[PDB]
């Protein structure tokens, strides 16, 4: 999804070109108005803190013993059928506090322990299959180490490595890289 870093990787100037300076100052002015924009409205309208009050109310709406279950089907929005812990299916009501986007049919769901409903999705544990074949780094064998085979190293370089380092070549002749 969204990336925390890389706000604007506009390194095209790649130099002391003034264009770098203009964009940076733009955010500064916007930041200044936002500062007194939030705190000012946060005094005469002490309803939601957004930092301690926002989280606090939802926790009460949640339950101390948060439940874990499998979402089995997606009935109309705000409504879903979630398989209970052991073997039961409940026609629970989806709460808007959830992102409402990660609700894949069968991943995971957190439910209140008394009025069971959807309270939140749970990230799925890395399945053991992925870890089985997820080679991290080739220990020691380099590419000049192989030696010997020369005309045969160009084919592999040109099928599984070039289209990822210099896509332009299979970008201007309109040819998809060998499968």
């Amino acid at each position: 999804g969204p990336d925390a870093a890389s706000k604007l990787p506009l390194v095209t100037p790649h130099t002391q070109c003034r264009l770098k300076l203009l964009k940076l100052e733009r955010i500064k002015d916007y930041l200044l108005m936002e500062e007194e924009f939030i705190r000012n409205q946060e005094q005469m309208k002490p309803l939601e803190e957004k930092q301690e009050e926002e989280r606090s109310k939802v926790d009460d709406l949640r339950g101390t013993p948060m439940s874990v279950g499998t979402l089995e089907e997606i009935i109309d929005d705000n409504h879903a059928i979630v398989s209970t812990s052991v073997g039961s299916e409940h026609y629970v009501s989806i709460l808007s506090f959830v992102d409402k986007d990660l609700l894949e049919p069968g991943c995971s769901v957190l439910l209140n322990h008394k009025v069971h409903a959807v309270i939140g999705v749970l990230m799925d544990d890395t399945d053991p299959l992925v870890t089985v074949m997820k080679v991290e780094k080739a220990p020691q064998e380099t590419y000049a180490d192989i030696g010997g085979l020369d005309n045969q190293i160009q084919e592999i370089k040109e099928s599984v490595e070039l289209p990822l380092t210099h896509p332009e070549y299979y970008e201007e002749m309109g040819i998809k890289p060998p499968k």
Binding site: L22, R26, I27, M33, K45, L47, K50, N78
Partner: protein, 495 residues
């Protein structure tokens, strides 16, 4: 010529096949056909537009008599206008046979036909300019109804025209209060957009025609918003030396003068990227009205923030939208502040899924708690990707149809007439040039349909007036052609 003849394939696209891909709705009813005109009227609107530019692709016109009988007496008046849309850009082809049948009864049906004339005659910019000669006579003729249709078409047909004779001529018709209010009100919007320069004489005169109105009409009108819009674009680029007269002479007026004066400032300051000018709008304006009963003003304040922010080097667009969600909806007022939904689609409306639509607007589209709230957001989505030519759009459209407010009729036509209409092919709606920083002064007309749908007194919900939702379309074509003097033809590729 090069699209159908040279190309071997030439298939037809009936409307029924794709009208209802999901069959859940038809299950259970097992037919149960009804003669409701509300259902029939909406369906015709969707079908009519898609059949444009299809001379031989017409099937519901030869035997269309039956459709006329299945509706109310007054329903056909709104549907009468849609007939003209089929024969788009027909200077004289369609009018040749209409004249011979003019000498006939049923003059009431003729009222709806004229509305179509304005759209077809818009953009041709004929040197002889036949629109006035073929429209002036009926306007001056003494009848509220027959000239009622002529009022809407005249403004749209002359978007590029800026002759002062028409603008002054139209003033008396709207200035005569002896006729229907709607007749004057609907006209006032058209005249505002025609003049994009200064037009000092009429801009001040237009203000006068609004000043000498009773407090009840001025306060509770629900129709005076468009008045500054025409003036706002008619005073763009003016400095403080010009607004000094307006401010000095507007110091002995009612507090409503502050309400209207706000719009002019933004339009005049087209490019004024800054923080000091924007701040008092949100904070000072919001706090002051909390001690009085005046309302319906903060909504316009937020929608106009798009100006001088459309093209922030393609970097301020994402930042601006984020603040709105956490500011205007996070803790804003319950109704007015929460109704800042049509602002997001106004800033950038071309179609960019997964980064600016699913998160910002798609989340609020399922607000089943209040159908009225969904009304603004349901129409908001269609505006920004009406014709994006993207095949990965229909999945979301079906995510609500058949799974939300289906029993209610008021919410029924909100989605069907708009959500299913986003499939129009070979069409583009972006107006920015290739550079993306130089906007078109007359191309910014896609701003009127951003508060009228909110109230809906004889605007959208009430049948009788729906051309307001058809006139704001002003864009270019998406087809590029190459040819030679002797019709040689090349196959040069593009990337």
């Amino acid at each position: 010529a090069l699209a159908r003849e040279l190309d071997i394939m030439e298939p037809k696209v009936p409307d029924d096949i794709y009208k209802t891909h999901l069959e859940n709705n038809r299950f259970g009813g097992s037919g149960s056909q009804v003669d409701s005109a509300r259902m029939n009227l909406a369906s015709s609107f969707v079908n009519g537009f898609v059949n444009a530019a299809f001379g031989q692709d017409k099937l519901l016109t030869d035997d269309g008599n039956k459709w006329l009988y299945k509706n109310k007496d007054h329903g056909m008046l709104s549907a009468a206008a849609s007939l003209g849309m089929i024969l788009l850009w027909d200077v004289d082809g369609g009018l040749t046979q209409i004249d011979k049948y003019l000498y006939s009864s049923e003059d009431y049906i003729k009222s709806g036909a004229l509305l179509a004339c304005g759209i077809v005659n818009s953009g041709v910019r004929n040197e002889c300019d036949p629109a006035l000669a073929l429209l002036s006579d009926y306007v001056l003729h003494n009848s509220n109804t027959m000239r009622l249709g002529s009022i809407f078409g005249l403004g749209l047909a002359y978007a590029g025209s800026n002759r002062e004779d028409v603008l002054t001529l139209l003033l008396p018709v709207m200035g005569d209060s002896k006729s229907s209010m709607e007749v004057a009100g609907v006209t006032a919007l058209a005249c505002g957009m025609i003049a994009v320069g200064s037009c000092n004489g009429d801009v001040t005169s237009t203000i006068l025609q609004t000043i000498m109105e009773k407090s009840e009409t001025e306060l509770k009108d629900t129709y005076a918003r468009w008045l500054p819009l025409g003036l706002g674009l008619n005073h763009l680029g003016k400095g403080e030396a010009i607004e000094a007269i307006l401010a000095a002479l507007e110091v002995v007026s009612e507090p409503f003068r502050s309400f209207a004066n706000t719009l002019v400032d933004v339009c005049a300051y087209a490019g004024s990227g800054n923080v000091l000018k924007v701040q008092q709008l949100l904070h000072i304006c919001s706090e002051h009205f909390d001690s009085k009963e005046k309302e319906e003003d903060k909504d316009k304040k937020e929608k106009k923030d798009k100006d001088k922010k459309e093209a922030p080097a393609d970097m301020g667009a994402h930042q601006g939208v984020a603040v709105l969600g956490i500011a205007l909806i996070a803790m804003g007022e319950e109704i007015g502040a929460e109704m800042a939904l049509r602002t997001f689609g106004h800033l950038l409306r071309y179609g960019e899924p997964t980064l600016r639509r699913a998160v910002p607007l798609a989340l609020a589209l399922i607000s089943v708690s209040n159908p009225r709230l969904n009304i603004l957001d349901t129409l908001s989505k269609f505006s920004h990707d009406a014709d994006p030519e993207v095949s990965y759009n229909s999945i979301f459209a079906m995510g609500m149809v058949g799974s939300g407010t289906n029993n209610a009729r008021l919410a029924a036509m909100l989605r069907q007439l708009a959500q299913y209409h986003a499939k129009d092919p070979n069409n583009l709606f972006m107006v920015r040039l290739a550079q993306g920083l130089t906007h078109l002064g007359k191309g910014t007309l896609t701003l009127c349909p951003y508060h009228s749908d909110r109230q809906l007194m004889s605007q959208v919900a009430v049948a009788g007036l729906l051309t307001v939702l058809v006139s704001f379309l002003d864009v270019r074509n998406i087809i590029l052609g190459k040819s030679h003097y002797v019709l040689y033809g090349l196959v040069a590729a593009m990337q």
